[PDB]
Swiss-Prot record, chains A, B:
The gene is GNPTAB. It is linked to Mucolipidosis type II: Fatal, autosomal recessive, lysosomal storage disorder characterized by severe clinical and radiologic features, peculiar fibroblast inclusions, and no excessive mucopolysacchariduria. Congenital dislocation of the hip, thoracic deformities, hernia, and hyperplastic gums are evident soon after birth. Mucolipidosis type III complementation group A: Autosomal recessive disease of lysosomal enzyme targeting. Clinically MLIII is characterized by restricted joint mobility, skeletal dysplasia, and short stature. Mildly coarsened facial features and thickening of the skin have been described. Cardiac valvular disease and corneal clouding may also occur. Half of the reported patients show learning disabilities or intellectual disability. Changing residue 75 to Q: In MLIIIA; no effect on protein abundance; loss of localization to the Golgi; loss of protein cleavage into alpha and beta subunits; loss of UDP-N-acetylglucosamine-lysosomal-enzyme N-acetylglucosaminephosphotransferase activity. Due to the low pH in the endosomal/prelysosomal compartment, the lysosomal enzyme-MPR complex dissociates and then the enzyme is delivered to the lysosome. Between 5% and 20% of newly synthesized lysosomal enzymes escape the binding to the MPR in the Golgi apparatus and are secreted. This is N-acetylglucosamine-1-phosphotransferase subunits alpha/beta. The lineage of its organism: Eukaryota, Metazoa, Chordata, Craniata, Vertebrata. Hexamer of two alpha, two beta and two gamma (GNPTG) subunits; disulfide-linked. The alpha and/or the beta subunits of the enzyme constitute the catalytic subunits. Interacts with LYSET; facilitates proper localization of GNPTAB. It comes from Homo sapiens (Human). Residues 274-309 form the EF-hand domain. Changing residue 98 to A: Abolishes proteolytic cleavage by MBTPS1.
Amino acid sequence: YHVLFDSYRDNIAGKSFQNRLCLPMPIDVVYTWVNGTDLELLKELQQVREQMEEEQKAMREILFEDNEELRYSLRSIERHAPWVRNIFIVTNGQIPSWLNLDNPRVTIVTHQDVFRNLSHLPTFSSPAIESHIHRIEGLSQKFIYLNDDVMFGKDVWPDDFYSHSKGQKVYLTWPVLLDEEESLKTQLAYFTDSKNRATFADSLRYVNKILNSKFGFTSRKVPAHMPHMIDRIVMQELQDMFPEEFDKTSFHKVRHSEDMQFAFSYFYYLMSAVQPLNISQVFDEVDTDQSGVLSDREIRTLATRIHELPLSLQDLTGLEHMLINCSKMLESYYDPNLPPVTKSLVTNCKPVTDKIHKAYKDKNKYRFEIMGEEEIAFKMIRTNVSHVVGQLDDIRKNPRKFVCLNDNIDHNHKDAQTVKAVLRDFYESMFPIPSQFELPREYRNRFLHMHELQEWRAY
Amino acid sequence: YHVLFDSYRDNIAGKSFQNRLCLPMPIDVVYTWVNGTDLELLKELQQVREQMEEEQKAMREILFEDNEELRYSLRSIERHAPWVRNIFIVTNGQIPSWLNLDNPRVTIVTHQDVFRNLSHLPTFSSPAIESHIHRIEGLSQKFIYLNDDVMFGKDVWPDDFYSHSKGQKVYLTWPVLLDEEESLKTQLAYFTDSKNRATFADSLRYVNKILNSKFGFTSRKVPAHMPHMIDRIVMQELQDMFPEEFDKTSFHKVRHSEDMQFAFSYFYYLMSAVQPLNISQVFDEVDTDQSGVLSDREIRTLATRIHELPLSLQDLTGLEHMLINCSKMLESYYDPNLPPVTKSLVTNCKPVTDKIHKAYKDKNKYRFEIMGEEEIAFKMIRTNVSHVVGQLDDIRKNPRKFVCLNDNIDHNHKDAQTVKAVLRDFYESMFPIPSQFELPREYRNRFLHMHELQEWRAY
Ligand SMILES: *[C@@H]1O[C@H](CO)[C@@H](O[C@@H]2O[C@H](CO)[C@@H](O)[C@H](O)[C@H]2NC(C)=O)[C@H](O)[C@H]1NC(C)=O
Ligand SMILES: *[C@@H]1O[C@H](CO)[C@@H](O[C@@H]2O[C@H](CO)[C@@H](O)[C@H](O)[C@H]2NC(C)=O)[C@H](O)[C@H]1NC(C)=O
Ligand SMILES: *[C@@H]1O[C@H](CO)[C@@H](O[C@@H]2O[C@H](CO)[C@@H](O)[C@H](O)[C@H]2NC(C)=O)[C@H](O)[C@H]1NC(C)=O
Ligand SMILES: *[C@@H]1O[C@H](CO)[C@@H](O[C@@H]2O[C@H](CO)[C@@H](O)[C@H](O)[C@H]2NC(C)=O)[C@H](O)[C@H]1NC(C)=O
Ligand SMILES: *[C@@H]1O[C@H](CO)[C@@H](O)[C@H](O)[C@H]1NC(C)=O
Ligand SMILES: *[C@@H]1O[C@H](CO)[C@@H](O)[C@H](O)[C@H]1NC(C)=O
Ligand SMILES: *[C@@H]1O[C@H](CO)[C@@H](O)[C@H](O)[C@H]1NC(C)=O
Ligand SMILES: *[C@@H]1O[C@H](CO)[C@@H](O)[C@H](O)[C@H]1NC(C)=O
Ligand SMILES: *[C@@H]1O[C@H](CO)[C@@H](O)[C@H](O)[C@H]1NC(C)=O
Ligand SMILES: *[C@@H]1O[C@H](CO)[C@@H](O)[C@H](O)[C@H]1NC(C)=O
């Protein structure tokens, strides 16, 4: 209504402060989903053949099952984060079977639009897709990146990702010829478990080395595995910031030890971005009259803010002498011979600008906030029924706003189906209600409810 | 426009989240101003006579200058905090000479409306007025209290006073017959310097004793002297919380060692307010289906959240036995004899509620946040020109969002007019532009500009 619109201009100034009080909206969600269809594995095996023959030429020259985390993640988005405008899922050519494509708020974005060099679409590597979300048509300036296996809880709000006062919120964790032989080593670890999508520590070390070479030496931690808020403008600045470095990440059809991630690279560039000093900004903020001419009080506050306290009169006299020097080379003051101090006089006197730069050291271009792992759930699910049930009960007793469960099950064990059933039971317990993004389905499905009962009986 | 209104319902849920994303508005400002007119001092002296004669009967039975802080504070409100809707000034009967009463956004509220028992209006004591701001007609639910001597800076925003996630922001500082003889002592310290308005540590100790008696023993700090955000609902709850205790503060016509303040009392009640446990809330949050009946997963999460991890099967079996006990006294489960678990069954089984209370201990009714003195300026201005100029230069070099300058000048010294001139110079330097609340005035005033120059020459 018009009353609501006019209520925001009812302050003393009479202006509007929507951009400072009502948080940055809209905010979108981006998912990276993949499926283990027969065509995907066939492309995988031919790519293995190509890489093997490439290595063969190199030393000749020298001479599966997914327990539906996307469904429950979308349910979590609907339940705890109902302020999301649009949800995007990036896939090669696969469309989720149970997603309701008729819903305008969910869209499948193929790799054709995501990638710009159409010769890299059969990439089959998560960092390559991670490097190019911000180029999606219709994406908001600020969006959250979801890794298809992280869920929400405790009614998460955008206040937990970005704040207008302290900037973005950064969550950190534990601190971080012959090349053909190294490439020969990389062909052994291709099938570890990570082609299930969405070799890691080495890449982190490479990014640390690059940032160290450009931003200087600093002890760096790694971001937590949790839904990350990404700014399109900042990410694009990072893209042009290392043009050829991002090419290598997109060029590789295998996640290589030499590439840069989505969170470590984006966040630490945000924390280390240096903005050049603006002399005009200094003059404007010091000049409270906005008249362009400084009085004795403005000169005094300049001297205090340039020099170091305590301020002796010699500092102010020297600053005045420096100011009168420049005028000869190029509302009454105490010193009769001191000319009017305008922006041009202070921005053209080289030693004065040098002292200003000495006082105004390099600031940070973007604000940021740092927090620990008191609100992030990262649990390890490895083939042990007792450990899994204990961890899930720990989740249940104390909910956290960011929940991650790595599904690297052995898949060849007597206690794999039971663990899968327990995980499905936990996911359905957290979020039973079907989401709006799900096609009408799951009729008379009756997933195994006795395996959970079986481990209850065993324990 | 209608597009702006409809944009807030463009999320997945389709609802509106104005009350959670756009901060609590409107927010008002309340000033406590007083002037040293001849009538005020005449009432002061007759009150001194009454108190002296009261003490005389007691042991018979046994047998000035203000340097315009309100102007610059209003200028600071306009410059750095332009989001304030209304500004209120509470005075006995005095109206500031230079205030523009034609401005609808500034209003003078007399003590008649502030006080409810019309027999206490000649109170002449700051805590008495402090106890009754929240009863002002037209005041917002959340407002900032200004002590007529605290200014703003660095473009303060409501984010620095209250946050929707962490609640209100609390700023703390350094940790905290025969009665007729004590009353005889109190008559000596009546004129110290504090009848200039807007005996202090003893009152803090009294409030600490009251809170200790009611909220238990806890090490308590004192709030900083800075513009405090006060909630009308919380303050009213505190008013009814100690009905007769607040009477003594309002009854006294002298700020007595036995009374309770505006910040220490309000804040620590906010930090210690205990809300009784709601069993219905527990049942609702545990029941994710909202169907009113709990399944095996809901029972399991109840057991995990009531008992202590690790959860043995004996705990769950005991909880189930307890549940089936109550039904006899008053979607298939694993135990065939376990009746459907509704809200009534769990809220009527006494031992289950006892265990829930044991797990769900007493929570805090209101959220709060704690910060230090890294953004509050409290400087001491005592008759020393060098100390004053050093402190003011320290203010200038590093601005802070909350600036306080106590004007307890000796007023009988060779260096009092110089200090007053330096203070006026600093205030005009920070905020030269006249505010909208000032009547057109200050023509050809030409306040002394040579005393600052005089101390420049001396130094
Ligand atoms: C993921 O891939 C599976 C195959 O790996 C696909 O599921 C097939 O769906 C078709 C229907 O078009 C059935 O005829 C096949 O029997 C299914 N295969 C299997 C192994 O069940 C589908 O592309 C994706 N399925 C899901 C659930 O995401
Ligand atoms: C699965 O995890 C459980 C813990 O939940 C393991 O139980 C531990 O067993 C060792 C020795 O067998 C004991 O010293 C520990 O005290 C047990 N843990 C607890 C919490 O009591 C169990 O061994 C794990 N199973 C496998 C196959 O590793
Ligand atoms: C504060 O009190 C002073 C007196 O203590 C008042 O100023 C007087 O204003 C009248 C005009 O109505 C003059 O005729 C008097 O000469 C003033 N007195 C003095 C001592 O200057 C007034 O009530 C208040 N003044 C201010 C500036 O707030
Ligand atoms: C006013 O404050 C200044 C400090 O700004 C005092 O100067 C100090 O004087 C003592 C001895 O006289 C020295 O030991 C200190 O080093 C001085 N301070 C500084 C910062 O150098 C001055 O004494 C004060 N004046 C009065 C009357 O107390
Ligand atoms: C990227 O595209 C350019 C032409 O636009 C092409 O020359 C280059 O080889 C491509 N990169 C590849 C194929 O890795
Ligand atoms: C920063 O500098 C640019 C040009 O150097 C100027 O246009 C801009 O107004 C400055 N920003 C300020 C004064 O805030
Ligand atoms: C520049 O200023 C200094 C004082 O800081 C003065 O001694 C010197 O003579 C000035 N330069 C010229 C060319 O006058
Ligand atoms: C407050 O008002 C009541 C009546 O409303 C009166 O009895 C009482 O004496 C008053 N308190 C005083 C005068 O301190
Ligand atoms: C708290 O309890 C009251 C009654 O005891 C109930 O009306 C209210 O809905 C409860 N709050 C919840 C369930 O959030
Ligand atoms: C209550 O439950 C306990 C098991 O915890 C059981 O031993 C007892 O018999 C029950 N009470 C009655 C009256 O049956």
